[PDB]
């Protein structure tokens, strides 16, 4: 730090209201690591909350951030090592003008309703595409057991 | 706890470890998981080269920390 863009971004995440994302504490030596909580609204994750880490590369905003889920989760696009294939921050769509609050917003959007035409976990993908409801009940005992509170 | 020792060959080796463990112990866990003899290993953390005989906590290695594994040149 340096990291004068990361400050403005932290400021305009804390004050942006952030209903679905909270308890955002940060490594304040260089704001290159954030931790926060995702609080899904629609089922099958509305009975849970999820610790994530956001890792900013040293050359941010030239390279995108990396999001990992610290809390386990049952999602066709999040592997069991917590990696989320979130398109807006992929190495192919990353723009410099993209702010972290838009990142989160699209992460939420991904939690609320997945997209299984491209999945990190194929099972799941098909268990969503076919059988939308056998998915949810399993997602629910996963979030019930493994996810966090409040929400 | 659990740490990631990262190489420049893009292998991430996960190690099972306690804050009590010495740098020598962690080198030993590397020799066992990779075959690399400790006398030719270099561990670095957050820009500090980890001296043998100290411990993970002296260096404040919390969990999920990434070490870096580099080899010593054969000659020296």
């Amino acid at each position: 730090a340096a990291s004068r863009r990361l400050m403005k971004e932290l400021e305009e995440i804390r004050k942006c209201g952030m209903k679905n994302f909270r308890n955002i504490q940060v490594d304040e030596a260089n704001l290159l690591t954030w931790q926060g909580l995702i609080v899904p609204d629609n089922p099958p994750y509305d009975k849970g909350a999820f610790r994530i880490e956001i890792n900013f590369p040293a050359e941010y905003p030239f390279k995108p951030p990396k999001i990992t889920f610290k809390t386990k989760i049952y999602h066709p696009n999040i592997d069991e090592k917590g990696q989320v294939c979130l398109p807006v921050i992929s190495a192919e769509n990353w723009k410099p003008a993209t702010k972290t609050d838009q990142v989160i917003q699209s992460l939420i959007a991904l939690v609320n309703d997945p997209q299984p035409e491209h999945p990190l976990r194929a099972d799941l993908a098909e268990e969503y595409s076919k059988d939308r409801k056998k998915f949810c009940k399993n997602a629910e005992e996963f979030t019930k057991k493994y996810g966090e509170k409040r929400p | 706890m659990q740490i990631l020792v990262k190489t420049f060959t893009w292998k991430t080796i996960t190690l099972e470890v306690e804050p009590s463990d010495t740098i020598e112990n962690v080198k030993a866990k590397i020799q066992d998981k990779e075959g690399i003899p400790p006398d030719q290993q270099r561990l670095i953390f957050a820009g500090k080269q980890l001296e043998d005989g100290r411990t993970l906590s002296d260096y404040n290695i919390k969990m999920g920390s990434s070490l870096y594994l580099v080899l010593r040149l054969p000659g020296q």
Partner: protein, 373 residues
Amino acid sequence: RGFRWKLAHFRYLCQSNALPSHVKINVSRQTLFEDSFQQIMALKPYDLRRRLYVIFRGEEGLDYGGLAREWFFLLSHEVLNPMYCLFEYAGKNNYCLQINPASTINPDHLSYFCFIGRFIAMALFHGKFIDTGFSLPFYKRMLSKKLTIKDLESIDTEFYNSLIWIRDNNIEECGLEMYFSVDMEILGKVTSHDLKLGGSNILVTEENKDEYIGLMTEWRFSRGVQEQTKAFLDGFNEVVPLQWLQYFDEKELEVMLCGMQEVDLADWQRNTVYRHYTRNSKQIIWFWQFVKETDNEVRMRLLQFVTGTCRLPLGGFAELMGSNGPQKFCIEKVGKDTWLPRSHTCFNRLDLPPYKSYEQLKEKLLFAIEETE
């Protein structure tokens, strides 16, 4: 006066400049790097132009048999191994060497880069190939050619896209908080570089944007390896004058250090994909007729045009990697035909405008791929 000729020229320069007698390189496989580095460093550049006698002790008199163009393969594999922290891979998924800024953690790193410089020049000088080579920007530096923003695409694609995004968009109402400085992590430790005086306090805006883009581009190529690079070029130049290289481009120099690779024309066709073309559009039919017809050197050059390298992964075309992950050789149909074909090495993609005659496709493709300055 193309590659064939450049090659004869370079070979003649070497022949015509070789000292007599021989030079003894005594190593053993078990201690190949330390023995090599010891042997080569004790000799004068001139001596490295005498005849080469390599001994592998313990294999000593039967064989050879042999021999050590094996030393060149084996050693190249040792000294260029990123584990040792002298050179590093260019990206996660593409595997051609560049200098690692972390190299300083080696007690005398400038010596080892001088060694390696000598070593490679020895390879060119004695017409021996080495196992894996360097990135194309690396080669351009050796030829003293200027590195440009498009040279970035191959070695750091995200940094490239970001750079270009900033060139091609108005940013005034964009709240980018960009300053003339830039940070880099090495071995876990983060450091700050100003790009001009007090650059960390100068704000990037529409009016300085171009200057900024400029300096970033240098910095990204140059960052943390000025001294190792000079050590290398010096070590190389003592053995084989860099000026002997002046007729070569960076792609030809790749091919001179690697051999001519084996391309299985079947393996290629099986694993090519087509965007807005098909296996039956006769631009493609024409394409594959050109791939079968010509030289093996044209094929490598073509392989360089579309993929940024003449080498193939372990396995063949079925496992071609790009920037973001795997990506097969791909031909896509682009607009007009008053263009030349273009490529995207990070996507491994040939943009082939629909040409009007097999001869037209043949002459334009061949002009695009041979004319890379």
